[PDB]
Scaffold this active site. Structure first.
Site, PDB file in Angstrom:
ATOM      1  N   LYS A  49       0.779  -1.232   0.000  1.00  0.00           N
ATOM      2  CA  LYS A  49       0.000   0.000   0.000  1.00  0.00           C
ATOM      3  C   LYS A  49       0.819   1.294   0.000  1.00  0.00           C
ATOM      4  CG  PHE A  90      17.818  -3.313   2.743  1.00  0.00           C
ATOM      5  CD1 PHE A  90      18.695  -4.330   2.591  1.00  0.00           C
ATOM      6  CD2 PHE A  90      18.057  -2.422   3.739  1.00  0.00           C
ATOM      7  CE1 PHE A  90      19.727  -4.524   3.469  1.00  0.00           C
ATOM      8  CE2 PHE A  90      19.073  -2.602   4.618  1.00  0.00           C
ATOM      9  CZ  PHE A  90      19.952  -3.624   4.471  1.00  0.00           C
ATOM     10  CG  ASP A  95      13.653  -8.836   8.031  1.00  0.00           C
ATOM     11  OD1 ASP A  95      14.877  -8.827   8.225  1.00  0.00           O
ATOM     12  OD2 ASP A  95      12.886  -7.922   8.469  1.00  0.00           O
ATOM     13  CG  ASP A  99      11.535 -14.540   9.090  1.00  0.00           C
ATOM     14  OD1 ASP A  99      12.471 -14.410   9.929  1.00  0.00           O
ATOM     15  OD2 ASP A  99      10.576 -13.751   8.889  1.00  0.00           O
ATOM     16  NE  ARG A 104       7.869  -9.849   3.243  1.00  0.00           N
ATOM     17  CZ  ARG A 104       7.648  -9.614   4.546  1.00  0.00           C
ATOM     18  NH1 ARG A 104       6.742  -8.736   4.907  1.00  0.00           N
ATOM     19  NH2 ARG A 104       8.359 -10.213   5.510  1.00  0.00           N
ATOM     20  CG  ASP A 166      12.493 -10.271  16.285  1.00  0.00           C
ATOM     21  OD1 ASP A 166      11.881 -10.694  17.292  1.00  0.00           O
ATOM     22  OD2 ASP A 166      11.976 -10.245  15.159  1.00  0.00           O
ATOM     23  CE  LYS A 192      11.912  -7.374  12.531  1.00  0.00           C
ATOM     24  NZ  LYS A 192      11.695  -8.808  12.681  1.00  0.00           N
ATOM     25  CG  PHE A 231       1.533  -0.044  13.263  1.00  0.00           C
ATOM     26  CD1 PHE A 231       0.411   0.185  12.498  1.00  0.00           C
ATOM     27  CD2 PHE A 231       2.504  -0.852  12.778  1.00  0.00           C
ATOM     28  CE1 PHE A 231       0.294  -0.341  11.232  1.00  0.00           C
ATOM     29  CE2 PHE A 231       2.380  -1.418  11.526  1.00  0.00           C
ATOM     30  CZ  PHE A 231       1.289  -1.150  10.756  1.00  0.00           C
ATOM     31  CG  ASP A 235       0.689  -5.430  12.508  1.00  0.00           C
ATOM     32  OD1 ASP A 235      -0.376  -4.898  12.118  1.00  0.00           O
ATOM     33  OD2 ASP A 235       1.705  -5.523  11.787  1.00  0.00           O
ATOM     34  CG  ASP A 236       2.555  -8.429  18.003  1.00  0.00           C
ATOM     35  OD1 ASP A 236       2.895  -8.339  16.801  1.00  0.00           O
ATOM     36  OD2 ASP A 236       3.357  -8.160  18.908  1.00  0.00           O
TER      37      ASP A 236
HETATM   38  C1  LIG Z   1       3.555   5.316   8.382  1.00  0.00           C
HETATM   39  C2  LIG Z   1       2.517   4.378   8.290  1.00  0.00           C
HETATM   40  C3  LIG Z   1       1.208   4.771   8.026  1.00  0.00           C
HETATM   41  C4  LIG Z   1       0.166   3.835   7.950  1.00  0.00           C
HETATM   42  C5  LIG Z   1       0.389   2.474   8.129  1.00  0.00           C
HETATM   43  C6  LIG Z   1      -0.644   1.559   8.024  1.00  0.00           C
HETATM   44  C7  LIG Z   1      -0.580   0.264   7.638  1.00  0.00           C
HETATM   45  C8  LIG Z   1      -1.789  -0.408   7.624  1.00  0.00           C
HETATM   46  C9  LIG Z   1      -2.080  -1.685   7.291  1.00  0.00           C
HETATM   47  N1  LIG Z   1      -1.080  -2.462   6.921  1.00  0.00           N
HETATM   48  C10 LIG Z   1      -1.352  -3.835   6.439  1.00  0.00           C
HETATM   49  P1  LIG Z   1      -1.598  -3.856   4.543  1.00  0.00           P
HETATM   50  O1  LIG Z   1      -2.558  -2.639   4.040  1.00  0.00           O
HETATM   51  O2  LIG Z   1      -2.348  -5.086   4.137  1.00  0.00           O
HETATM   52  O3  LIG Z   1      -0.124  -3.700   4.195  1.00  0.00           O
HETATM   53  P2  LIG Z   1       0.172  -4.777   6.780  1.00  0.00           P
HETATM   54  O4  LIG Z   1       0.394  -5.364   5.407  1.00  0.00           O
HETATM   55  O5  LIG Z   1       1.132  -3.738   7.271  1.00  0.00           O
HETATM   56  O6  LIG Z   1      -0.114  -5.877   8.020  1.00  0.00           O
HETATM   57  N2  LIG Z   1      -3.311  -2.238   7.342  1.00  0.00           N
HETATM   58  C11 LIG Z   1      -4.384  -1.453   7.725  1.00  0.00           C
HETATM   59  N3  LIG Z   1      -4.104  -0.133   8.060  1.00  0.00           N
HETATM   60  C12 LIG Z   1      -2.842   0.342   8.012  1.00  0.00           C
HETATM   61  S1  LIG Z   1      -2.295   1.817   8.353  1.00  0.00           S
HETATM   62  C13 LIG Z   1       1.728   2.108   8.381  1.00  0.00           C
HETATM   63  C14 LIG Z   1       2.772   3.033   8.453  1.00  0.00           C
END
Ligand SMILES: Cc1ccc(-c2cc3c(NC(P(=O)(O)O)P(=O)(O)O)ncnc3s2)cc1
Ligand SMILES: Cc1ccc(-c2cc3c(NC(P(=O)(O)O)P(=O)(O)O)ncnc3s2)cc1
Lengths: 341, 341
Positions: A49, A90, A95, A99, A104, A166, A192, A231, A235-236
């Site tokens: 994204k 990178f 990683d 791992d 990915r 880690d 990290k 954040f 995620d966890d």
């Molecule tokens: C600086 C910055 C700003 C916004 C994000 C966000 C990542 C993200 C997100 N990431 C998800 P993705 O949209 O499926 O990549 P992940 O692939 O990182 O587990 N998913 C839903 N909302 C958000 S907001 C991460 C870093």
């Protein structure tokens, strides 16, 4: 999203990034390497994204007097956003090899493609090198040039340090829960992921805007590392309890012996009988033995602890924005907060 | 040697390099990472002859008015010499993993040590990062700071590009001799080894001495890349025909399908019957099938072609020193020439 506005312009600039990293048109001898570099860029820097790189751009709009947003300034902001994405690419290529990951983003990891293998290590290093080539090509004359080089270099080091921590903490193959402490967890997250993910893109925008004071950066850092912490904790949590449709792919954290926020809390909150049940079942392949850890977490009401944590953290981040944002426009931090909460 | 004079002072400064990269004394959280970093430094940056790093120091003596060799200037020259050795250690840790090597200097490669494995990829990147931390810690205020950062970054990129080219040219597992051309061989040598080995250390000394003009650098580069070319061609020769006692360890170039100078010449000099005999026997494990390629080289009088090449190259390098050294003291280049011929 202020993000879906700049997005197309950011993804389209990628073609230029690539053209310029390939066109070494005066040196035909290295043609084959340069084509490989093209393939590495396109496979690994495209597909996500672009949240981190876009943040560079959004923050740059918000920070620079709009009269100083001449076509070349924005060329440079798009490029520096792409630099953050290449740094990320990178880290992730490398990683995935460390791992032994398979995919990915539901796509085959670069090192697993037929004919790549461990050559991906050089490819990863080439991704990192492209950052400084772009900074030179686009930003050499600018007063923030050296500031940006040092920022990217410092972001690599912090991330690599975090990675070491880690790797020492949760070696795949060694169940040791005595290593999984709150302090260690926080420390891994900060080095990290939070520095490059949250501090780096805003700080880059800041320097491009001429905002180079140490205290201003220290102030933005304090807010942004907290956001990075939240954040990753989210995620966890989602990894296990995320509704897997709304979210993405089912989570393998428990199977992999990860230092997850969840196991950290579980351990703090545990009868000595509980610790044994976790010592036994954590880090295993077996579905019904991962279904059993999920139930020990559910039984400890860690989803409620999470919800309680998410609210507390939201107030804290707002108190921090109030206290430390000035004289940057609070919206720089608030757009980010809105995307992550 | 002007090298055995500065050596002890260079090896002793390593203790300081290490102390300063470990003492992150304000941050106890990362203690375990920092200890791992210490172990990585000591295992991988110590053990060789330090030719590249020492060159920084020797050249710095020869280039700077001796009245500007205050104790801190030499601190900085020792540090920058150590930076060149760390860059080297980054390349080699990572190359050993990519080659699946077993030993390096008769010692077990870092990635093969019990408990390291592919984590060595992060360790290698940490070696590279240490370079910019030292440059900052020691050289931040100096007018050549940015010049040095760009030089090290550029040296990484050239080396990585060369590595890609090597990997595309001679994939271990794919006998294809059509790839082994003189132009390709030269190109691999120049990017992969000559720039960091020969240009980099002298150029670093130059910038520290205030000699920053582009033409001066271009002039030193033209001499030093030629030396790097010869140096590698001599390595390929000694690999097979080196008296293995006088030299080091017996050579495995033919076994590994390497783009050696020898196979390149062999191919240029070959009846179409010869090419087949090489197509069949090149890249094999079997001792008697590597003894058979050695005999095809001997039969083509490539040792005589080498001796003829070494003389021609010696005159050429001297003509180049004559023409391009001024206004640097010719002894900067001549010390190097003396060490390699
Ligand atoms: C600086 C910055 C700003 C916004 C994000 C966000 C990542 C993200 C997100 N990431 C998800 P993705 O949209 O499926 O990549 P992940 O692939 O990182 O587990 N998913 C839903 N909302 C958000 S907001 C991460 C870093
Ligand atoms: C800048 C510079 C200056 C001198 C050298 C030399 C390396 C070297 C040398 N290297 C040998 P080593 O001394 O066993 O390391 P190798 O390990 O590189 O195959 N052996 C004999 N003479 C020389 S001169 C390499 C680079």
């Amino acid at each position: 999203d202020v993000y879906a506005q700049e997005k197309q312009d950011f993804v389209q600039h990628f073609s230029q990034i690539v053209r310029v990293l390939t066109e070494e048109m005066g040196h035909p001898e290295i043609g084959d390497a340069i084509a490989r570099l093209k393939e590495v860029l396109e496979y690994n820097a495209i597909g996500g994204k672009y949240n981190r790189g876009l943040t560079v751009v959004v923050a740059f709009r918000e920070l620079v007097e709009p009269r100083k947003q001449d076509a070349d300034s924005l060329q440079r902001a798009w490029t520096v956003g792409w630099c953050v994405e290449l740094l990320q690419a990178f880290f992730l290529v490398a990683d995935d090899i460390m791992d032994s990951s398979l995919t990915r983003r539901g796509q085959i990891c670069w090192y697993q493609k037929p004919g790549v293998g461990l050559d991906a290590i050089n490819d990863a290093n080439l991704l990192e090198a492209c950052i400084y080539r772009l900074l030179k090509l686009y930003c050499r004359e600018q007063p923030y040039y050296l500031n940006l080089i040092e920022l990217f270099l410092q972001s690599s080091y912090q991330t690599e340090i975090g990675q070491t921590l880690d790797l020492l903490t949760a070696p795949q193959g060694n169940v040791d829960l005595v290593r999984f402490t709150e302090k260690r967890y926080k420390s891994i997250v900060k080095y990290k992921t939070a520095f490059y993910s949250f501090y780096l893109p805003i700080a880059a925008a800041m320097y491009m805007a001429g905002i180079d004071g140490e205290k201003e950066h220290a102030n933005a850092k304090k807010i942004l590392l907290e956001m990075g912490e939240f954040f990753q904790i989210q995620d966890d949590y989602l990894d296990l309890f995320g509704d897997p449709s709304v979210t993405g792919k089912i989570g393998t954290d428990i199977q992999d012996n990860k230092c997850s926020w969840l196991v950290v809390q579980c351990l703090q909150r545990a009868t000595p009988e509980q610790y044994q049940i976790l010592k036994e079942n954590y880090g295993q392949k077996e579905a019904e033995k991962v279904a059993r850890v999920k139930a020990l977490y559910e039984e400890l009401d860690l989803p409620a602890v999470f919800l309680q944590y998410e609210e507390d953290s939201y107030s804290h981040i707002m108190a921090l924005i109030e206290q430390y944002a000035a004289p940057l426009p609070p919206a720089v931090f608030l757009g980010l907060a809105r995307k992550i909460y």
